[PDB]
Design a protein around this ligand. Structure first.
Ligand SMILES: [Ca+2]
Length: 223
């Protein structure tokens, strides 16, 4: 997260870190057994880390639970990033309390102008590299479909939305991928892609979670 703020420990209780020996992507806990992330974050051997603030220090609220199964969206296209969503099942159920909690799925799609909370452990610089150890947060609005398409001609599908600031300086970034965009207490987006980070006229692009609620529910119900 570039141009954000330190969230505070366990203030984003649905945020998870996906770990394969190291943090590599975010995700969102949607029930005791299941995490939403980006399909482009897929790999084998994932350990889901819940209750994290500093990802390099054991602070006392963590739950580390290996994944049993990952399910990339049936129509994920890694070239275009269309349908950039996957589900990860935990080998055992997480213990839920105020520091580790699921986030609700949306019942309707959010609108341009709505304020959301984007979070993650990704790079905090737009030029060069600095990774935080504690969770960063950014409040940002959803942008109009027209301004999103004008920013990224030929690239924005109906399964994507832009959020952030066209002036630059505030955005998600590498290492945030797969993490949440939460608006009015609902998971509306997944950190997906963008041109660089925090660049002028290059806002963040997010997977539009409301399009996937029926797939998510039916997949969980049978897996
Ligand atoms: Ca920790």
């Amino acid at each position: 997260i570039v141009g954000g703020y330190t969230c505070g420990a366990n203030t984003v209780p649905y945020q998870v870190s996906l770990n394969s020996g190291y943090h590599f992507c975010g995700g969102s806990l949607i029930n005791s057994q299941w995490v939403v992330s980006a399909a482009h974050c897929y790999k084998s051997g994932i350990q889901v880390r819940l209750g994290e603030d500093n990802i390099n220090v054991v602070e006392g609220n963590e739950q580390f639970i290996s994944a049993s199964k990952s399910i990339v969206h049936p129509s994920y296209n890694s070239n275009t990033l269309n349908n950039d969503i996957m589900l990860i099942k935990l080998k055992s159920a997480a213990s839920l309390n105020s520091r580790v909690a699921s986030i609700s799925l949306p019942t309707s799609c959010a609108s341009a102008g709505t304020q959301c909370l984007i979070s993650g452990w990704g790079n905090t610089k737009s030029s060069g590299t600095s990774y935080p150890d504690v969770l960063k947060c950014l409040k940002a609005p959803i942008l109009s479909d027209s301004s999103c398409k004008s920013a990224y001609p030929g690239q924005i599908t109906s399964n994507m939305f832009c959020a952030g600031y066209l002036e630059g300086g505030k955005d998600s970034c590498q290492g945030d991928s797969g993490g949440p965009v939460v608006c009015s207490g609902k998971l509306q987006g997944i950190v997906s892609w963008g041109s660089g980070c925090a660049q002028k006229n290059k806002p963040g692009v997010y997977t539009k979670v409301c399009n996937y609620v029926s797939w998510i529910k039916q997949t969980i119900a049978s897996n």
